[model samples]
Every structure is written in structure tokens, then in C-alpha cells.
Target: KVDLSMNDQIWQLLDTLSRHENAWPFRKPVSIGEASDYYEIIKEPTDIQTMKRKAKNKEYKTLSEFSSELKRMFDNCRFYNAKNTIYTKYANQLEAFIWPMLQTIQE
Candidate 1:
């Protein structure tokens, strides 16, 4: 009775993302001291771990909300990493693959 299907779906999406080889760099948050460069620039930092925690806690109510945070994760990566770098490249590919699944869920 407590299981929200969307929560399960979102968790599955994160799992799929975690399996991708390039998802390594994004599996967790960039810590404050570790990212004086990152911390100062990308305000409101987030990561997969945090996302999973929120989902487990049922903080997200809709797929749209989850989608926005997912994009935010990608956006932070792109903003922090230089263009054409492996980080951005991986970010692009993963985001590309994930968007359609999210739309199908909402559709």
C-alpha cells in the first residue's frame, strides 16, 4: 500500500543510470572542501545518492519533479566540466537515453 509506482520507476531509472560505465563520476555528490572550485560555482549541489535517498524517503511526488532533478544533475556536470570532455560527453549520452523513458512514463 505504501509503494508509489512512480517511486519504484524512478529508482529503476537511477539503477539503469548507475550501471552505465560513465556513471562512475556521478554516483555521489561533490563534497564542499573537495570542490572549492565546484562548490562555489554550482550552487545547490546534488547527486545520485541524494536522489535515491529522496526517492526512498518519498520526497518526490511526480515524475516531472524527478525529471527536473535528473536534468539538474546533468546540467551541473556540463556546467562544471569543459566541453567535449569525457564528463560532458557521458553526461550528454546518459541524459539523451533517459529523457525518453521519463517522457514515456509521464505520457
Candidate 2:
């Protein structure tokens, strides 16, 4: 069982992360709290140019293809590495943000 109460908080964090352009690569090494504050809330428009091209050419016809391309956008970011403490901190926050989604998927 998973607590539903934290769902709102998770979404809020995700929204914050998606909004900020500087969320992934921190300007400098800082604590998780500081990183969150450093990145200002500014939701930029998503670049759908590649998706548009795929749709035009009918390249991504399956969900798997779409998901793979989508994941590729953030795959290069090194936040998941355990040794990079600063980026790892950001990754931890991302894990926290996704926990609710994971729980829902599991259920």
C-alpha cells in the first residue's frame, strides 16, 4: 500500500522540476535545499520539433518508440551517478518526485 497524501507534493515537485531550465545541471555544487531555491520557477515551452518530425514521417508508431525517444532527452544527464553529490542530490529529489507515480503504476 502507498500513501496517497503525498501525491500532491510529488506532483508539485515534478512541476517545479519540469518548469525550471536549470534544474538538471546545477550552476554550482550546493545542498539539495539550495539547489531547489536556486532554480527559479519558469515553465518553458517543450521542444516538440522531433516529435513533430516523427509524426510527419510516421517514425514513432508505437508507444515503445515514443518512450525511448522521450527517455533519451534526459539520459545524458549525470544526476543519477552516486559519486556526484551535487547532481545526486537533485536526482534524489527527482526520485522523491516520482515515488507517487511509481506507487500508482505498481498498484
Candidate 3:
């Protein structure tokens, strides 16, 4: 699979979020606890919870699996606001804003 460190993965996600105007309303924390709080408020995906368990257990078979789940978390989180027109618009913009970082991780 891929070969990104956990810090790299977290950094990319944080960087993507920080660069998005929609995410500007949220507090940006460089630490894991604050980041977790941010995720908690935005949307906590089941996949992310599952992935976190697997990560804690060291059960991931490859870095790619973790990366894929991470993207799924983002996708799920973004779509959570789809029912609201205004928020959906922001979600769309946020998705576009983070696309480059997603591609970079895949590469």
C-alpha cells in the first residue's frame, strides 16, 4: 500500500482543513486532542471510530488501508451536512479545497 507516517497523514488533513474557508469557523489545533475535538464537532464518522480502534490495536494491514479509511472519514463528514443547502455548499467547497492533499497522499 502507501507508506505515509501517522504524523504525515494527520498533517495533510490539518493542512487541508486550515486552507479551506469553510473550515475557518472551526478552531485549528495542532495537537491531537484539539484535533479530535474538531472532528467531534464537525462529524464523527463510524469508519473513523473503527479505524481508530484498528490503529490502536495495530491491526491495519497496510498504510493504504488507513489512508483509505481516512478519506472515507472526510467524505462521510462532508456529506453529513448535505441535507442543509448552505452547509452543503460549504462542504462542496471544502471537498474541492482538500482534493489536492488527497491526491498527494494517494500518490
Candidate 4:
């Protein structure tokens, strides 16, 4: 009686993860529209050193600033480039159901 579609299942899982991982604090939801924004933010002239500088300053107190700091951490940790890092880190969860079928759609 669940009537579970793929999207439904994926959303359920993401919701579970957000709850369990405490993704509430400092972690904001990124929508498809936000992808380009994120890319621009990461691909800006700032570097690891600069990012750490902002993070340490405590001056960037807005949600956007905090989000950018989180983005910086993503860049540092994901090993790939900023864009790919965002894709790998967020796309999977955001596009959860559709992602698995992407190859099929491509083919």
C-alpha cells in the first residue's frame, strides 16, 4: 500500500539521511537552480587558503557566507574539481532516482 515510486523512495532516503546526519546545522539544501550558483561560488578566484581565511574570520555570518564556507570544505575534501565535487557530493542525493538511470537514458 506504499505506492512507492523511485522518486518517493529516494526522497525518503534523503530525508532519513538529513535527519541522521544532522545536516541541519550549516548544511543547506541545494536545488537545481542553485547548481550554477554553487559552481560560480567555487570557481571564483578564492583558494583553499582564502577559504580558510574567511571561515576563520567569523565575519561571514550570513547564510550565503556559511554556504560558501561549506562549499570550500567540499572542494577541499572531494578530490575532484569543484564542479565534479558538487556533483559527486550533492547530485547523487539530489537526483537520487534519476541518477541511476542516467546511463540508460544516455545510451
- Please give the distance, in angstroms, between residue 82's alpha carbon in candidate 4 and its true position after superposition: 10
Runs in model 4 with CA error above 4 Å?
25-107
Candidate 2 lDDT: 0.40
Query: Model 2, 1-107: lDDT tens per residue?
Result: 64523323333333454555545453223345744542232222112344344545545445455434434323322323423755555545654564454344211
The better candidate by lDDT, 1 or 3, is 1
CA displacement after TM-score superposition, residue 12 of candidate 4 (Å): 0.2
Scored by lDDT, model 4 comes in at 0.39
What TM-score does prediction 1 earn?
0.85
Q: Could you tell me which 10 consecutive residues in candidate 1 have the lowest summed lDDT?
A: 98-107
Q: Model 1 clash pairs?
A: none
Clashing pairs in 3: none
Query: Which residue runs does candidate 2 get wrong by more than 4 Å?
Result: 1-47, 79-107
lDDT, candidate 3, 1-107, per-residue tens: 96766545645465556556666433222245534454555444443334445655656566576666655554554565444656556646765776666555432
Q: Count the backbone clashes (under 3 Å) in each candidate.
A: 0, 0, 0, 0
Cα TM-score per model: 0.85, 0.30, 0.44, 0.29
Best by TM-score: 1
Model 3 residue 106 CA deviation in Å: 6.5
Estimate, for each residue in 24-82, the C-alpha lDDT of model 1 and write its tens digit: 88889886675668987888777888898887887888777888899999998888885
Off by over 4 Å in 3: 1-6, 24-82
* CA shift of 61, model 3, Å: 6.6
TM-score pick, better of 3 and 4: 3
Q: Summing lDDT over every window of 10 consecutive residues in candidate 3, give the lowest-scoring window.
A: 25-34
In terms of lDDT, the best-performing candidate is 1
